[PDB]
């Protein structure tokens, strides 16, 4: 669960505060939504296990 | 001098049966601090949300 947090779920980088200083807000919306969806799926799998 | 459970308005036009709806746009939190000018005197308070209650008969505060 810890190692899955640093995973690029289709985004530019898996670290916050990095895609907000090099991209536009409208693109940052999707760049954050992808990571949010990936982390939610990982946490749901963890909760099921 | 305290809005004890006062200022509860209908947030929308939706009719609801027996249930417990959670409203986010509703304002005027309970037990607030109102500023009553019980004297009347023309004053210019702030805005973006108010609670204009009149406890005087014959509709004194009408404008």
């Amino acid at each position: 669960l810890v190692k899955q947090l640093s995973s690029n779920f289709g985004a530019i980088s898996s670290v916050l505060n990095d895609i907000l200083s090099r991209l536009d807000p409208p693109e940052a919306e999707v760049q954050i939504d992808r990571l949010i969806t990936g982390r939610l799926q990982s946490l749901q799998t963890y909760v099921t296990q | 001098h305290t809005s004890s459970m006062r200022g509860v308005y209908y947030p929308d036009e939706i009719f609801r049966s027996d249930t417990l709806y959670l409203t986010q746009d509703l304002f005027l939190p309970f037990y607030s601090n109102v500023t009553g000018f019980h004297t009347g005197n023309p004053v210019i308070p702030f805005k973006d949300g108010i609670y204009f209650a009149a406890t005087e008969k014959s509709n004194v505060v009408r404008g």
């Binding site: - | 209908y10 939706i14 609801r16 249930t19």
Partner: protein, 49 residues
């Protein structure tokens, strides 16, 4: 009098006043569901319920 339409507990539009005249209640859900097939066995017969 001020309320125009109304929703249900499931956040779905239940009733609404008639805009033309004779303001009364409105739509109820229709019939739906999963149709099941009852078969006594293909080798036995060809009937089906």
């Amino acid at each position: 009098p001020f309320q125009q339409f109304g929703r249900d507990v499931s956040d779905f539009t239940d009733s609404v006043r008639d805009p033309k005249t004779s303001e009364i209640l409105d739509i109820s859900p229709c019939a739906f569901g999963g149709v099941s097939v009852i078969t006594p066995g293909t080798n036995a017969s060809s009937e089906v319920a």
